[PDB]
Design a protein around this ligand. Structure first.
Ligand SMILES: Cc1cc2nc3c(=O)[nH]c(=O)nc-3n(C[C@H](O)[C@H](O)[C@H](O)COP(=O)(O)OP(=O)(O)OC[C@H]3O[C@@H](n4cnc5c(N)ncnc54)[C@H](O)[C@@H]3O)c2cc1C
Ligand SMILES: Cc1cc2nc3c(=O)[nH]c(=O)nc-3n(C[C@H](O)[C@H](O)[C@H](O)COP(=O)(O)OP(=O)(O)OC[C@H]3O[C@@H](n4cnc5c(N)ncnc54)[C@H](O)[C@@H]3O)c2cc1C
Ligand SMILES: NC(=[NH2+])NCCC[C@H](N)C(=O)O
Ligand SMILES: NC(=[NH2+])NCCC[C@H](N)C(=O)O
Lengths: 583, 583
């Protein structure tokens, strides 16, 4: 029979295993072996150190599955709308196929976010009468979204950028219009070769860019990524749709993928195993044969015996690929082998994305203190005639965004009220990292070897809690001394996604890349080595997807490999929804 | 005889060889072997791709040694004042010993810098007339230096912090005073376990931090480094002295170290060899024996046969040590060996610094356009009662500082006028990197394999030049359309110090480290490994020094190793000048 070897039991790896079994590619006598560096709880409470999987982690207060939770990784999705050909199609189909559609609930955000900008408090609806304190004439009396839409329209001109296929085409063929007005960028410049921040800065000035970066919504990405993709993902015609979440947490999607793959595998006579605390150490090819070594979590740098497979999936992000590639980069390899991950074209294409570091502080309170009548600037979470919302509040601080989940339990547990504090971007990674160690302690673990998110949300230090309460005091009172009015959290924990093996909260397509060509060709990296024998060794996950902010992208790259390289029938309707861009 | 093997012919490795020969440690029949990954011009025109050495690189316009030049790397030093015991002692002594004292000139800075902040132009002298556009009451009417001094005084309290010994002592034992007023940090907290930006932000708010980060002078440093060291190095009582530079370029120091070491070695009967385009690939120990492999610059990841030495100096920065450690981290090492750089204590102490990325754009003009009478906001490089100066101009843009070197040529008939544009910090690395590739082209070199500074300053793309002229037009005219008035540069080149093998412009001691213990013990890393046989393998350079901004720190750590481990008599007077901190 046939063995399918999957390295990484994140969303992409779990989805792959589930499709091979339920789609009937893996038949009685076949083997699917899943290897995961971490030790996730797939088999209920006590079966792991955190819920699955990868950068999705539902965190229950007190690790009590009946309690309020905060998503310490990915938190929401966009429901597929087949009439609009918009939304997370594979996520929506997968939730339905797993029997979880009944648990889908609205994720409501406020129409009127509090903006805390240069020590001013402005509810976004008041910008016409209380201009934002940025020297950007016109723009400062409008929500940042208006400036986003205006900058996108200066880049896309009259190009069609409304459909997913049109957006994909703009990545490769999109040019600045004949009317582009710039000292720096000529009309007709290839937009894929331009940095988004570079051109936003050119067109709107430092104050226009800073306002957009500080006051913009969660889903508008202002890093210096590919301007062609950024323009179509931040513009008037950006993909949208209704935000939803899975009541009880996103992590149950990954528990169910595992459990239902195992039950379907038993019915089909397929051998499906998950081996945790076991990482891919090194990988290489001998013609079509994938050679690999594993390492234990206890001793992650030391390989075991050389193993072979004909089918290998690297279901892991760039920083994770880098650690594997480092194990052969400097090695004297056996005669007639191909050190595939270190081939020039593979390395070049792996650099087709840039990295955004992220840190999430999760705090549970015994009361929703932000709703008290005497809070000077409460978050605008519940308008009359509309539903309740989770915020956010949006700031120019290190603590750039706050969500207020409150009591999201079934209400049977002792009520606690959750807050999510978001820290992001290269600017701030060194700011938050020193809060991760107690003020009475020296560092003990080399930073590159602290696999904190892999293990689970880490207890917040007293310094970390006090910093979050100081920033929330400035946001909601405008007085740092008001931190004394905030009750001390009953639990506070963090996830620092900049740490290995994740190395990033988010990936974004880089300037100076043909995105469609990287999306197409990086999946089977032998294709990037002239004269190499084809091997069924694949790279999958959200990082090289067309949906980088989302589990959808991890599913879509995985689906595209099953379709293109295993001839499987897609579960999606791709007529208006290319899983990845075609060139 | 005795063989001394030095990996890295930057300032530290060159200084080490020079002292071994001229100090009479290496005697007739001994050998000194220097290996350098790069190919620096030690032997005049035609002998390399750039002037020596490491992160010091004088760049002459059009490669004409009689033209104007800009320091594309380190640019100035503080002359030693033996009376006050203030300044860069080893740099001053070395320049004198090499016969270069006659080339030392003042490096003067304006006392009235032009500030370009949130689209406002303010000469620093006018901040009482026109406060800085930051909502930081009082602070915004005074130079940023006053706020830096005030924060330092809140951290240091009554502790003496004027001497090197007392500053060193504050790193390890310095506590916040009993009067420290903070929600986040208790009185008496260990300052070395606090991030400087974290506590600056706590005490001065985001608008006080931003004003200090944006308007602070040349040497001011707001990154989140060790608060004990930052408080004493940003304080009113920061290390001072008169700023100087070497007319004709700092690179001649390193040319002369090499040439004079070779001459002295030939006279002494010491065999002194510099082997360029040849890197240390991997290193390890067998008892006291240093085992290593070398790699060619052509094939930098493939080691040759195993070599040995009894005396080995790793004269290279953290990012360079990291690349050597990667070559053995994942390897199955020979029986009875110690993989020294991957030992837990060594890895921990290597993380005792954080990295600051830097990019320098060097632009030569055919006339000093910034002095033209119709320029709205010229730099104040003249003053009625002061000598002329190099600037800077200080901004809140990606282009954070500008220096104006003008005509420093030595005998050309057509002099050019030079400008240095500084981009720094984790915030902006991704902003500047996409300007490094032509807007018509895709990226062709994997980013971690683009050894740009090692080869030499790279031609600025037309996009990079137009970006810099746009920012200079905003600064000096307050109109981005004025970029058309700036003459196109004669030559424009850049150095991106974030790239391998440097991986940083600057290193800074990290919070949550005992600085003195790292400074002392990282130099001979076997001392960090319980049970290890002692070996003469050393780590030297500016990164783990007490003078991290400076060539002085490379010389000091090198000197400290020759004194402590080779029993050499120091050339310094250490009475009031510890080479490194004592614990
Ligand atoms: C702060 C944050 C918020 C997010 N919010 C959302 C959101 O609201 N909605 C949403 O849909 N998405 C969200 N995402 C994105 C979502 O988390 C990712 O798209 C998704 O987790 C990607 O899945 P993946 O399988 O590609 O990678 P990962 O989740 O990174 O999983 C990779 C797996 O590979 C493992 N691995 C790595 N190296 C090895 C090795 N050598 N051998 C074996 N295993 C290894 C890892 O331990 C991990 O389990 C968010 C992400 C972050 C960081
Ligand atoms: C923007 C900037 C401005 C500065 N301004 C000043 C200033 O004004 N004055 C001042 O005094 N200092 C200044 N400095 C600092 C100065 O450049 C450094 O202190 C100094 O260069 C450090 O010397 P080093 O020998 O420790 O390291 P480096 O200069 O980094 O040299 C290390 C050497 O090791 C080599 N190497 C690396 N890996 C290997 C390998 N595996 N095998 C062999 N060789 C290898 C490198 O190629 C390099 O030649 C500045 C630095 C920067 C980036
Ligand atoms: N389509 C986008 N670019 N979305 C931006 C990121 C949203 C993010 N995944 C979240 O937590 O909701
Ligand atoms: N990280 C920094 N702020 N570095 C700048 C320090 C001073 C710098 N070496 C000089 O040329 O004078």
């Amino acid at each position: 029979g046939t063995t399918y070897t999957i390295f990484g039991a994140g969303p992409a790896g779990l989805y792959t295993a589930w499709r091979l079994v339920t789609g009937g590619k893996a038949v009685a006598g076949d083997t699917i072996q899943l290897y995961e560096w971490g030790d996730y709880a797939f088999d209920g409470p006590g079966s792991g150190t955190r819920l699955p999987a990868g950068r999705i982690v539902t965190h229950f207060c007190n690790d009590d599955p009946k309690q309020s939770y905060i998503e310490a990784g990915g938190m929401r999705f966009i429901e597929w709308d087949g009439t609009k050909s918009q939304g997370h199609q594979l996520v929506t189909l997968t939730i339905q196929a797993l029997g979880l559609s009944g648990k889908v609930i609205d994720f409501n955000t406020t129409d009127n976010p509090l903006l805390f900008l240069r020590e001013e408090h402005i509810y976004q609806n008041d910008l016409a009468t209380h201009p934002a304190p940025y020297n950007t004439p016109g723009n400062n009396e409008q929500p940042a979204a208006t400036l986003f839409s205006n900058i996108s329209a200066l880049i896309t001109g009259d190009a069609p950028v409304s459909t997913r296929t049109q957006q994909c085409a703009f990545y490769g063929s999109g040019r600045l219009p004949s009317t582009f007005n710039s000292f720096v960028y000529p009309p007709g410049s290839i937009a894929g070769n331009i940095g988004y921040w570079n051109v936003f800065y050119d067109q709107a000035g430092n104050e226009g860019y800073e306002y957009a970066a500080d006051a913009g919504g969660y889903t508008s990405n202002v890093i210096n990524w590919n301007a062609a993709n950024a323009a179509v993902y931040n513009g008037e015609f950006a993909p949208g749709g209704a935000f939803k979440t899975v009541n009880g947490g996103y992590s149950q999607v990954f528990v169910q993928l595992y459990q239902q793959t195992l039950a379907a595998a038993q019915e089909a006579g397929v051998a499906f195993t998950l081996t945790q605390r076991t990482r891919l150490h090194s990988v290489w090819l001998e013609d079509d044969v994938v050679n690999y070594r594993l390492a234990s979590a206890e001793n992650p740098f030391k390989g075991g015996a050389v193993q072979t497979t004909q089918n290998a999936f690297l279901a892991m992000p760039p920083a994770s690929l880098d650690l594997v590639a480092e194990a052969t980069r400097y090695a004297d390899m056996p005669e007639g082998t191909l050190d595939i991950l270190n081939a020039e074209g593979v390395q070049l294409y792996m650099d087709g994305v840039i990295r955004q570091p992220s840190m999430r502080v999760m705090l549970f309170f015994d009361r929703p203190w932000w709703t008290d009548a005497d809070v000077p600037y409460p978050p605008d979470l519940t308008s009359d005639g509309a539903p309740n919302t989770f915020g956010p509040t949006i700031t120019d601080l290190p603590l750039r965004q706050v969500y207020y989940f409150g009591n999201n339990s079934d209400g049977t547990a002792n009520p606690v009220y959750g807050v999510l504090a978001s820290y992001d971007d290269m600017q701030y990674v060194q700011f938050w990292q020193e809060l991760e160690i107690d003020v009475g302690e020296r560092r003990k673990v080399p930073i590159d070897q602290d696999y904190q998110v892999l293990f689970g949300p880490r207890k917040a230090t007293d310094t970390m809690i006090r910093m979050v309460l100081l920033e929330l005091a400035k946001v909601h009172w405008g007085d740092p001394n008001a931190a004394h009015q905030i009750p001390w959290p009953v639990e506070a924990i963090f996830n620092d996604f900049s740490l290995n093996p994740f190395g990033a909260g988010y990936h974004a397509w880089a300037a100076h890349y043909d995105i469609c060509d990287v999306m197409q060709r990086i999946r089977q990296p032998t294709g990037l080595v002239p004269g190499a024998t084809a091997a069924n060794l694949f790279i999958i996950g959200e990082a090289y997807s067309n949906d980088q902010a989302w589990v959808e992208g991890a599913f879509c790259t995985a689906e595209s490999v099953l379709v293109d390289y295993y001839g499987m029938t897609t579960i999606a309707d791709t007529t208006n929804y290319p899983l990845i861009c075609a060139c």
